[PDB]
Amino acid sequence: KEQNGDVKEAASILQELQVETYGSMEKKERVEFILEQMRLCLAVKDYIRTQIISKKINTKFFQEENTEKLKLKYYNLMIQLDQHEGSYLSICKHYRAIYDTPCIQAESEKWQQALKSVVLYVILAPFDNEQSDLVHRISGDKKLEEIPKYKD
Amino acid sequence: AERGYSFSLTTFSPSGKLVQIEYALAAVAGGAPSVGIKAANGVVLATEKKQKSILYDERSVHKVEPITKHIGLVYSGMGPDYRVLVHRARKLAQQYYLVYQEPIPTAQLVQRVASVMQEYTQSGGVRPFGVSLLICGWNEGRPYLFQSDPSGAYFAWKATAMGKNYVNGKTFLEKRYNEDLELEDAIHTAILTLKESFEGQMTEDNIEVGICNEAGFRRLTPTEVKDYLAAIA
Amino acid sequence: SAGFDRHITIFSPEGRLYQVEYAFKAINQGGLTSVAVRGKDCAVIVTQKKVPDKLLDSSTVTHLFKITENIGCVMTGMTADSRSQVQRARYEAANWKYKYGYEIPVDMLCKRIADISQVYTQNAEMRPLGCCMILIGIDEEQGPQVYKCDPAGYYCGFKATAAGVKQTESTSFLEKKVKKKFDWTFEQTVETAITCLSTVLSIDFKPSEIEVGVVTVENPKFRILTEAEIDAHLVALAERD
Amino acid sequence: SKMNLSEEVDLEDYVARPDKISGADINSICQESGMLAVRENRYIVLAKDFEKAYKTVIKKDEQEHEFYK
Amino acid sequence: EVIELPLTNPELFQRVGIIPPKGCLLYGPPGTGKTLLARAVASQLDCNF
Amino acid sequence: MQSGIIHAAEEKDWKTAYSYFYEAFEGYDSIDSPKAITSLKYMLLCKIMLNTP
Amino acid sequence: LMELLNQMDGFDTLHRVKMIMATNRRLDRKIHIDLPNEQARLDILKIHAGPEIDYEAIVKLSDGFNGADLRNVCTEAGMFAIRAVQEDFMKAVRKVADSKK
Amino acid sequence: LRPGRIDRKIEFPPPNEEARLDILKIHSRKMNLTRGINLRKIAELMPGASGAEVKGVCTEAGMYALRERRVHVTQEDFEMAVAKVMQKDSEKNMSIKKLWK
Amino acid sequence: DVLPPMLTSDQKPDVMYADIGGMDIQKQEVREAVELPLTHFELYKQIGIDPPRGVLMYGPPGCGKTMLAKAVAHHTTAAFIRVVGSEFVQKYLGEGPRMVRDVFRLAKENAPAIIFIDEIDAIATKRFDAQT
Amino acid sequence: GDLVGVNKDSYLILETLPTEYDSRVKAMEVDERPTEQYSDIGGLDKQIQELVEAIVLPMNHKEKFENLGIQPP
Ligand SMILES: Nc1ncnc2c1ncn2[C@@H]1O[C@H](COP(=O)(O)OP(=O)(O)O)[C@@H](O)[C@H]1O
Ligand SMILES: [Mg+2]
């Protein structure tokens, strides 16, 4: 449906599965289903449903062996949601998780984009105690490549 | 309270109560609302025929039943006991007709039905009738509305309500009832008194109403009850 | 209030008959269930049939009785009480036909049985026999008729009813199915009854573990459907459902 | 007030519908309708949810014996 | 159906769940699986008894 | 309507004032009286003064 | 019960505090259970078989509710005749038949 | 009740309208009674009422005065207080009322 | 030296008069009985009245009377001791009366206070002639 | 939980004590073993057999119980 030039109703078709109750073989098929629900909801601009679905995924599962593309896509979706919502420290935290992901941490540009995003979304957040703590942490990351612009 | 003297019907409690007949009257008060109003030129009886489901064919068992061409009867209480009492009332009316070639007066029918209830409330192996009857007749040239209790006591009423919300019904009738009320207005008063204690939507086919004018007692058809409900609302 | 409990004739301080209520509990004691539904021009009773032994003659085991040529009943509850009340119903129908010269109306037979039961509920001579009788017949002026004769003198007429363990579930199912096009045909009524039993019991029926009796306007004689007819109904209606 | 609903969910006639529901009954109705919505996802509370909850609560007072009446 | 309560809280926000329910009755005959019935579900939930 | 007016005037319980105004509106609507626009106006006024316009 | 200070709860102010009450005859829910099962006794016996045709053979006449059935099977099988883990087959059927309840 | 243990036994009948006038005066002494107010009329309006009932009558009339930001009590206030305090919960059911002739 | 010296009236309920819809007359009466005396006593003294301490709220279940009790407890300035009438029927001889005495003594010691007895029908019924 | 001698005043754990059994607990044991029979109890063959199993068999034939997966209550 989504491929056939109509997503408004294709989102509804997919937004009916109770994958948490279905009982898949493991937490892989269900997680893929949930992330695709997320993607369709964001495509149709249904951020309330997107947030509700996000609360249905336990991030602790992403600290596993093959949960790398899943982690990357899930986070990218969270950044999209928070970018619409207007927040910036949550976007920072999501980009920082993306950076911490080893797959992102195995190529020059791949990790450099994540680190620039983390720096910029530290900067864009309002000044609070937590924001200052994150500023200090990113400053002490030591892997900033001393890029003459973001470092300064 | 007097706990020992509440299982038998042939013993006075130390204070003189006959507790079991009062318990029968409690069974009466825990029944479907019914209302009776004695208009100036007739009488009207109403009672909720609300069923416990849509499956109950609400056209087979009636609650407002005739006993003669000029007497009818409704009840509040248990339906089986009501059936027994209506059969006995019909039999008594027929006996009176055979003896005296004249329709039984409403007062006499009430006396005899109360006597039947007394017969049933005077032994240990028999349970008092757990119903209160409202009899409405057009003997002579004036209307009669009577009540008969399990105890065998019978009353003459201007207007009354019995069942679950009889207190509210009687207060409403005190507010609304006036002696010089035509039967057409009394029907509206009866239906309104029912509404004040009728949960759910009072559809034409879940309420039962019977009038008693000089033409004789007659249970209003559901079409007529629908017309009255529409006019009232 | 437990003192007002051992005698059928004692009113509880709030006006309740605990022994009558216990008779109803006795209805819900045979384990079986029964359902009845009336269409435009037919009435159908279907009863769960348990034969938990190879030595028990299934032909003799039954809960559908022919009260008269044109009236049938399904009994649920204690079997001895069921058969006693069936004999009483047959006797009353025979007396009616003898005295008045025409076949007893179904509603009249139900009223007679309900009055007989009310007598026991009022006087203290017997226990109220704990069985529920669902009667079906064809009335010449009204059409198909289904009635109940519970053991307290209550006998309301029904568009569709159930009795036994799962009477509440069957009642809910039939309410839902009758709010939508209560107008049923013969096949549709048999479908509705059998489906109600199957869904409430959570089982699909073999042709033998079910007993169906039917009356129709065209053929107003209580007929107990044979195994072949039951199997035909089950297979055809499950296939075309 | 604390709950939030749609714009076509007027309580303005559920009040008018005759019944003997008490304050506890109304609170139960509201809670049950909210639970219906959350259980069925459908991230709004609507007139159908209130209708079902109202029917459930009002009909809860049943399943008694019918010769008593 | 009691696992919705902890994993998220849409019961707040638009609606109110009066501190959404704290479980179901688990109506059971003399004994079938009551304890283990709850054990397995809570083990899935990762909660503790 | 008079009870709602007095409640609005004196106690500053505009919730109760609105309740009474709605009852008056319903009665005057059933009677189809011309004193129903006033009851509607007063309900809207109570809604405004409740800081929920 | 001769205790009335133990009235209902309602002190709830913490998240993740769900309860599970269990009895027979706020919490507004319920889950009916039946003591037997239509065919689940097969799986009950298979899972309790700590030490399938004979499982079905036991199930034909099986009428039970818990794993005490299979525990009795195993003990009354091993410690009675074989001395006098499979190797039981119809012996478990014999035990379930012996089940008196 | 044997004498020697309880030598004397004093009955306290409800006031006989003169004791009621006395009690009204006693409990209205500390009160701003308007002119033309007839405690004798109130006493007559209170038949078979105890001293507690009379004190409650005074208190409830005072509460009526308090309601209307007043420090003033009038005959209407006492009459309404009498009505509110001597409110009887007579039998509801005419059947139970008419069992006895 | 003397040490500064308890059992109830500490968990101030969160309900408030604004949480209750309608029930205007009952709210007014309960206020006049239990709140006005403790805040505006000059009002009662000026008329020369003893405030009506002690009220009864009778009615069908689930009509917000325990909730009004909790509302007065919330907007209470002194103390609110809550008990249930069925809690006075304990087994051992002469303990229901002992707890009644303890509750009232606790209120007196805790100075201006509001006792609440949720279901008094258990104990406070027509006295009747006992025989056991 | 252990029996240790302790200095009276400082209450410091001095040399430890192995075990203490009350005189009554020592007497709480059969010195002269009773001996009549099993056949000397009639009627309750089922109960005697069940008790013999559930007590003695775990004591002597312990290994077979865990071999077969039996929990000897
Ligand atoms: N007037 C009211 N306004 C709001 N809620 C009410 C009201 N009356 C009752 N309730 C509801 O009923 C519950 C309390 O009922 P309760 O006061 O215990 O009744 P009762 O004490 O008569 O049994 C509360 O949870 C509340 O939500
Ligand atoms: Mg309460």
Curated annotation (Swiss-Prot), chain A:
The modification N6-acetyllysine is found at K69. Coiled coil: none annotated. Belongs to the proteasome subunit p55 family. Component of the 26S proteasome, a multiprotein complex involved in the ATP-dependent degradation of ubiquitinated proteins. This complex plays a key role in the maintenance of protein homeostasis by removing misfolded or damaged proteins, which could impair cellular functions, and by removing proteins whose functions are no longer required. Therefore, the proteasome participates in numerous cellular processes, including cell cycle progression, apoptosis, or DNA damage repair. It is linked to Stankiewicz-Isidor syndrome: A neurodevelopmental disorder characterized by delayed psychomotor development, intellectual disability, behavioral disorders, mild dysmorphism, ophthalmologic anomalies, feeding difficulties, deafness, and variable congenital malformations of the cardiac and/or urogenital systems. Component of the 19S proteasome regulatory particle complex. The 26S proteasome consists of a 20S core particle (CP) and two 19S regulatory subunits (RP). The regulatory particle is made of a lid composed of 9 subunits including PSMD12, a base containing 6 ATPases and few additional components. Interacts with ERCC6. This is 26S proteasome non-ATPase regulatory subunit 12. It comes from Homo sapiens.
From Swiss-Prot, chain B:
One of its GO terms (cellular component) is ficolin-1-rich granule lumen. It is found in: Cytoplasm; Nucleus. The modification N-acetylalanine is found at A1. CDD domains: proteasome_alpha_type_2. InterPro entries: Ntn_hydrolases_N, Proteasome_alpha, Proteasome_alpha-type, Proteasome_asu_N, Proteasome_sua/b. Phosphorylated on tyrosine residues; which may be important for nuclear import. Keywords: Acetylation, Cytoplasm, Nucleus, Phosphoprotein, Proteasome. This is Proteasome subunit alpha type-2. It comes from Homo sapiens (Human).
Swiss-Prot record, chain H:
It comes from the Eukaryota. It is found in: Cytoplasm; Nucleus. Component of the 19S proteasome regulatory particle complex. The 26S proteasome consists of a 20S core particle (CP) and two 19S regulatory subunits (RP). The regulatory particle is made of a lid composed of 9 subunits, a base containing 6 ATPases including PSMC5 and few additional components. Component of a complex with USP49 and RUVBL1. Interacts with PRPF19. Interacts with TRIM5. Interacts with NDC80. Interacts with PAAF1. Interacts, in vitro, with the thyroid hormone receptor (in a thyroid hormone T3-dependent manner) and with retinoid X receptor (RXR). Interacts with ERCC6. Component of the 26S proteasome, a multiprotein complex involved in the ATP-dependent degradation of ubiquitinated proteins. This complex plays a key role in the maintenance of protein homeostasis by removing misfolded or damaged proteins, which could impair cellular functions, and by removing proteins whose functions are no longer required. Therefore, the proteasome participates in numerous cellular processes, including cell cycle progression, apoptosis, or DNA damage repair. Belongs to the AAA ATPase family. This is 26S proteasome regulatory subunit 8. It comes from Homo sapiens.
UniProtKB/Swiss-Prot annotation, chain I:
Component of the 19S proteasome regulatory particle complex. The 26S proteasome consists of a 20S core particle (CP) and two 19S regulatory subunits (RP). The regulatory particle is made of a lid composed of 9 subunits, a base containing 6 ATPases including PSMC4 and few additional components. Interacts with NR1I3. Interacts with PAAF1. Interacts with TRIM5. Interacts with ZFAND1. Keywords: Acetylation, ATP-binding, Cytoplasm, Nucleotide-binding, Nucleus, Phosphoprotein, Proteasome. One of its GO terms (molecular function) is ATP binding. The chain holds residues 141 to 279 of 418 of the full protein. It comes from the Eukaryota. It is found in: Cytoplasm; Nucleus. This is 26S proteasome regulatory subunit 6B. Belongs to the AAA ATPase family. Its main location: cytoplasm. ATP binds at G59, P60, P61, G62, C63, G64, K65, T66. GO terms for biological process: blastocyst development; proteasome-mediated ubiquitin-dependent protein catabolic process; proteolysis. Component of the 26S proteasome, a multiprotein complex involved in the ATP-dependent degradation of ubiquitinated proteins. This complex plays a key role in the maintenance of protein homeostasis by removing misfolded or damaged proteins, which could impair cellular functions, and by removing proteins whose functions are no longer required. Therefore, the proteasome participates in numerous cellular processes, including cell cycle progression, apoptosis, or DNA damage repair.
